């Protein structure tokens, strides 16, 4: 159970609206064996292993280039916890419980 966040940002798009580019990135992500959740600042992910995650990230990145962008700025944050199984929801609830 690996949790992560991915943001694929095309640059020099000549439009401040990037939703179609992001939807294309997510559409590419959907083809891999990962769970995702679209959030206000990037797409949240859950994967069973690093290989799938990297393949999903490469796919998302490539989809934006294929979509027509000549410059893509991609960010990936990985939270890999091996001494406990924690999904996105588990982590949210753990923090809330402590508030």
Give domain limits for the chain: 2-99
The CATH architecture one would assign to domain 2-99 is 2-Layer Sandwich (3.30)
Task: Tell me the structure's resolution in angstroms, rounded to a single decimal.
Answer: 2.3
- Sequence-distant (6+) residues with CB within 8 A of 59 are 28, 29, 31, 32
Alpha-carbon distance of 13 to 56, in angstroms, equals 23
| Structural element, H or E, at residue 4 | strand 2-10
DSSP β-bridge partners for residue 47 = 2
Tokens 């989809």 locate to: 63
Three-class DSSP category at 75: strand
| Residue 33 CA from chain centroid, whole number | 13
Tell me the Ramachandran region of residue 25: left when phi exceeds 0, alpha when psi lies from -120 to 50, beta otherwise.
alpha
Alpha-carbon distance of 47 to 36, in angstroms, equals 9
For this PDB entry, the determination method is X-ray
Nearest to 1 by CA among 94, 86, 93: 86
Query: How many C-beta atoms lie closer than 10 Å to residue 8's C-beta?
Result: 28
């Amino acid at each position: 159970m690996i949790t992560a966040e991915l943001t694929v940002i095309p640059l020099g798009t000549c439009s401040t609206s990037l939703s179609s580019y992001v939807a294309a990135a997510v559409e590419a992500l959907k083809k891999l064996n990962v769970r995702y959740e679209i959030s206000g600042m990037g797409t949240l992910l859950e994967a069973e292993d690093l290989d799938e995650l990297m393949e999903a990230v490469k796919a998302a990145h490539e989809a934006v280039l294929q979509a027509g962008s000549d410059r893509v700025y991609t960010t990936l944050k990985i939270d890999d916890r091996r001494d406990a199984d924690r999904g996105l929801r588990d982590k949210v609830e753990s923090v809330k419980e402590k508030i």
